[PDB]
Design a protein around this ligand. Structure first.
Ligand SMILES: [Cl-]
Ligand SMILES: [Cl-]
Ligand SMILES: [Cl-]
Ligand SMILES: [Cl-]
Ligand SMILES: [Cl-]
Ligand SMILES: [Cl-]
Lengths: 136, 21, 136, 22, 136, 136, 22, 21
């Protein structure tokens, strides 16, 4: 991150963007009903565990996601393919954990939000919705 | 090519998760 | 907000998006050096007060922004114009607070992050940077 | 049209802050 | 369209945008090699016919797309799903024609180009490529 | 451009995107009223002349626009500053010609459309609108 | 809901094209 | 820095255009 925080202006800009973003997230959560808050909590517990256990896997998978030929759009479609043939909870949790890791290492906020938004549609198929609502 | 293989490894990780669970 | 959360899918999708973004922001903060965290604290302290003190002013100004003919592009340029002549700290803090409020009420995460990114450049002019760096 | 006037209220608010912050 | 062209400014702004985009497309074409221009001719010939032959079908399908709950993200995934099982040329040409029609009626240039970019990846699977390359 | 047209798929994808984009532009123009068509024509004649005469200038200005530290957002604000102090037609035409040149050499379509959209707001101030309507 | 059905009409249209294109 | 100078050169080009016109 220090490769982008070169000048005082970069620091201050970073500070303002963080604040704007943090405030938005806090106020969003403030507005969410109990049901949605429960789902966030469930996703947190399960994906924190997956990301921790398979931390080494997530890291090298990122290393090839950083190759020139990689595109989020093609990756999205490959995920959509996988979910259609396999209906286990694991692969969906694993996909969330990986996209989250891609997000942590993406310093382009706009690109990141786009990735999050697109993949969230893809990951949340009726199969996934069934699992989270059962665990509710 | 890479996106095709990553998604395959996520499946493997997923099945692994499902079995230990 | 509850017009966006109609089905179970909408709820779960919202939960996934929140987790991804929250995780990103958490990891971003962990990477920030002391200097940037200090600037975040300063913006937090000063803009929270402006947002509270002028809360009524912020609300009614949002009502103007929800106008059909309002555009972030044009607003950015007017903000840029104001700051060139007005070099006080107040107008810069007030703009952040207003933009933050626009973010709280914007459900499209992509358009929101676009707005934050653009306006942060415009707000963080040399004058604003000088102010933030003076404090601590 | 609305953006011009909003930015002027921010200018007004900014002045109130500056005077009191002194 | 004429609801977007209310003031003289809206007209001039539209004129500037058109010039910039038209100039870009002109210069892009000049740079394309013979092979790519041939593929463009093939898509032009085949999708124009589909668009004309099934013009009524395209219009009523747009009416479904203008639905509140319709999203390009979800549509992309359904298209991806269809193409995996259906390997005929027709469904690929029809999708292009439909997406092209969505573009004609979309006034937001950013959302439109986003749609084109995403769906082009999804439509141009190995099967479609094999079809286009066979012709000439 | 050949650095991106590596595989048959890249060519075909390029072909589909061009078609979608070209069709949109053609149908947009088809819908434009005489007034807007006149403005496009006027912009075409004047900016073609500027781009031709100052072609060498536009080229080196691009070379520094390609430096890491360059951002469209900061450039936009600098343009907004310039226009506020100088009300001649020339600088506005020059800015259109330069942004157009930036567009010709940007292979990211989404980034390009964003640039076009933002700068079009900035360039089309009341001063510019007055000139184009006079030349009408 | 609407996207699922649209994509099926495209599938239908595609079949008409394939048969006639033969 | 570069954006600040480019915009300045566009002004110069603009004034040049206005004078020959
Ligand atoms: Cl951020
Ligand atoms: Cl969000
Ligand atoms: Cl356009
Ligand atoms: Cl958007
Ligand atoms: Cl393009
Ligand atoms: Cl982007």
């Amino acid at each position: 991150i220090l490769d982008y925080l070169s000048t005082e202006r970069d620091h201050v800009m970073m500070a303002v963007r963080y604040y704007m973003s943090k405030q938005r997230l806090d106020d969003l959560y403030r507005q969410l009903p109990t049901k949605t808050r429960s789902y966030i909590d469930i996703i947190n517990i399960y994906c924190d565990k997956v990301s921790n256990d398979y931390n080494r896997d997530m890291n090298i998978m990122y290393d090839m996601a950083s190759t020139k030929s990689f595109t989020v759009y093609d990756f999205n479609n490959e995920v959509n393919t996988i979910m259609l043939d396999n209906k286990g909870l694991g692969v969906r949790l694993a996909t969330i954990s990986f996209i989250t890791e891609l997000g942590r290492r993406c310093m382009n906020p706009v690109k990141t939000i786009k990735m999050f938004t697109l993949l969230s549609h893809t990951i949340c198929d009726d199969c996934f919705v069934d699992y989270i609502t059962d665990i509710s | 090519r890479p996106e095709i293989w990553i998604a395959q490894e996520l499946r493997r990780i997923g099945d692994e998760f499902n079995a230990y669970y």
